[PDB]
Amino acid sequence: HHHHHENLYFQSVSGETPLEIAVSLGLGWNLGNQLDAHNNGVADETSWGNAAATQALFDALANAGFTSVRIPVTWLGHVGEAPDYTIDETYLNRVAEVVGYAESAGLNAIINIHHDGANSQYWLDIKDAATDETVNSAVKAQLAAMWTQIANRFADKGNFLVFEAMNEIHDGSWGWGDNRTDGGRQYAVLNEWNQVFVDAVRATGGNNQTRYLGVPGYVTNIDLTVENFVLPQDVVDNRLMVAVHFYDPIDYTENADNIYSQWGHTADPSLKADWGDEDNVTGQFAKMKETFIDQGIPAYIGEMGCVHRADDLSESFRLYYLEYVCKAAKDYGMPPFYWDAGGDGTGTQSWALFNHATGEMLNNAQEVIDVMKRGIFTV
C-alpha cells in the first residue's frame, strides 16, 4: 500500500508506482497524420488527409471518455542550423495551440519528436551515429538544443503535459538490421540519446524538473526494449516511463494485403494471420510487466489499434481485438494510446474514429470507443 491522496486540482499525470501512473493516463488517443505529417521536406499538418486540428476535436475526445492524447510532432523543415538548431517560432506556437486544446479539454498530453527519426533517413540518424562519433555528437547536440527550446516553451505547464524523447528509432531495417549484429552499439547509442533528452529537459528547471517523460526502446519493439533498454539516470524518482508500440499482428491490424479479416481463437484459419493471437498479447505484455512494471518502472503503449472493416462479421473481430488488447494493457500495467490517422474514414485501411477538425465521430466509432473504455475503466 504505497498509494497516496491526490491533493491537487487540475488534470495531471500523477503517481509514484506504475499502476497509479497508468490510472492517471487512462485511455489514450493519437492525433495521427497531423503534426507528424510532412511533405517536400517540411512538416505540413494538412498534407496527409486531415484538416487542421481544433479545440472542437479535443472537446469531443474528452466527451467520448478519453483521458490522454499523444500529439506526434515532426519538426523537419522547421529547425535551423548548428549550433543553435533554432525552432521556427510559429511552428512551436502551433504545437502550443494543440497542447492548449488538450489542456482546455481536461486531457493529459504527450508531445514528441516524430518523423525526424523516420528510418534513420534524416538528422536523427542512429545508423551513422553508431559508427561515427562526429555524427553521434551532432545528433545529441540537436536533440539537446531542440528539447531545451521545447521544454522552455512549456515551462509553465503542469504535469498534464508529458515529453516523449523520440518515436521509432531504427537503422532502416526496422529491427532486423545491424542492431542485431553490431555487438550492441546501436542499442547503446539510443540509450545515450534518451539520457541526453532527460538531462536537457531537467536542466531547464522549474516544472520541467518533475515532469513525467517518455523514453523508447529500439523501434518501440517490446522484445528489443526489454532486452536492451536502460533506464536513464534522473534527478527525481519515478518520472521516466518506457514507451513501446504494439500492433501485433500488423498484417491483421493494418490490413495491408486485404486478406486477414479475422483474429483470435474463433477466427477461420483461412482468414487470419498465422501468428499474433491472444497468447501473443498476454505473452508480450507479460514481458513488459516482468521487466518494468513489477520493478517499479512505469511503461505505456504509445501506439496500438486496428483498422475498420465495413463487413459486419469482420468488424466484430476488430472490436474483439481492441477490447482484448485494452483489457490486457490494463491488466499488465500500461495505458494504451489508439492510433488515429484520421482521413475520410473510407477504404480498407482506415484508423479514423473522429474527423480531426470537426470532432465528429465517424462510422461506428462509438462502439469501438465503448469497447476500449470497458477494458480500461471496467473491472
CA 143/CA 137 separation, integer angstroms: 10
Q: How far is the CB of 91 from Cl ion (least distance, A)?
A: 42
N-term to C-term CA, the chain: 20
Residue 174 binds what, of Mg ion, Cl ion, none (CB under 5 to 8 Å, by partner type)?
none
CA 268 to CA 265: how far, in whole Å?
9
CB 96 within 8 A of CB 56: no
Q: Verify whether residue 303 is a known catalytic residue.
A: yes
Phi then psi dihedrals of residue 196, to 5 deg: -60, -45
User: In whole angstroms, what separates CA 210 from the centre of its chain?
Assistant: 20
User: Per the omega criterion (within 30 degrees of 0), is the bond before 232 cis?
Assistant: no
Interface of this chain with Mg ion, residues 81 to 100, rule: CB under 5 A: 89
Stretch of 2-10, 44-52, 65-73, 317-325 contacting Cl ion, by CB under 5 A: 2-10
Name the residue nearer to Cl ion (CB basis): 104 or 280.
Answer: 280
- Verify binding: residue 4, Cl ion, rule CB under 5 A: no
Asked if 3 touches Cl ion (CB under 5 A), the answer is: yes
| Shorter beta-carbon distance to Cl ion: residue 174 or 275 | 275
Report in angstroms how near the CB of residue 3 gets to Cl ion at its nearest. Answer: 4
280 touches which of Mg ion, Cl ion, none (CB within 5 to 8 A by kind)?
A: Cl ion
Q: Which residue out of 20, 164, 168, 323 is catalytically annotated?
A: 168
Q: Which is nearer to Cl ion, 8 or 82 (CB)?
A: 8
| Buried/exposed 100-126: b ≥16 CB within 10 Å, e otherwise | ebbbebebbbbbbbbbbbbbbeebbbb
Q: How far is the CB of 240 from Cl ion (least distance, A)?
A: 24
User: 42 or 188: whose CB is closer to Mg ion?
Assistant: 42
Q: State the Cα–Cα distance between residues 319 and 325, nearest whole angstrom.
A: 10
Catalytic residue among 6, 290, 303, 323: 303
Query: For strand 108-112 and strand 336-340, is the pairing parallel, antiparallel, or unpaired?
Result: unpaired
Judge whether 97 is annotated as a binding position. Answer: no
Task: Sketch the per residue contact string, 265 through 304, with Cl ion: x for CB under 5 A, - otherwise.
Answer: ----------x----x------------------------
Give the nearest distance from C-beta 285 to Mg ion in angstroms. 35
Number of residues binding to Mg ion, judged by CB under 5 A? 1
For Cl ion, which is the closer residue by CB, 3 or 180? 3
- Closest approach, Cβ 40 to Mg ion, in A, equals 5
- Which residues have a Cβ under 8 Å from the Cβ of 43 and sit 6 or more positions away? 35, 37, 73, 74, 75, 76, 77, 78, 91
Give which of 28, 27, 46 is closest to 342, Cα–Cα.
Answer: 46
Strand ranges inside the chain, DSSP E: 28-31, 38-39, 42-43, 68-71, 108-112, 161-164, 213-216, 240-245, 299-304, 336-340
Contact status: 137 vs Cl ion (CB under 5 A)? no
Using the rule CB under 5 A, is 39 a contact of Cl ion? no
Number of H helices, E strands in the chain: 11, 10
CB of 276 to Cl ion, least distance (A): 5
Active site residue 168: yes
Q: Does 176 bind Cl ion (CB under 5 A)?
A: no
Name the grid cell of 124. 536523427
String marking each residue 43-82 x if it binds Mg ion according to CB under 5 A? ----------------------------------------
Nearest to Mg ion of 19, 96 (CB atom): 96
Binding of residue 121 to Cl ion (CB under 5 A): no
* Residue (of 40, 90, 50) closest to 72 by Cα position: 50
Contact footprint for Mg ion (CB under 5 A)? 89
Binding residues: 89
Contact footprint for Cl ion (CB under 5 A)? 3, 275, 280
Active site residues: 168, 303
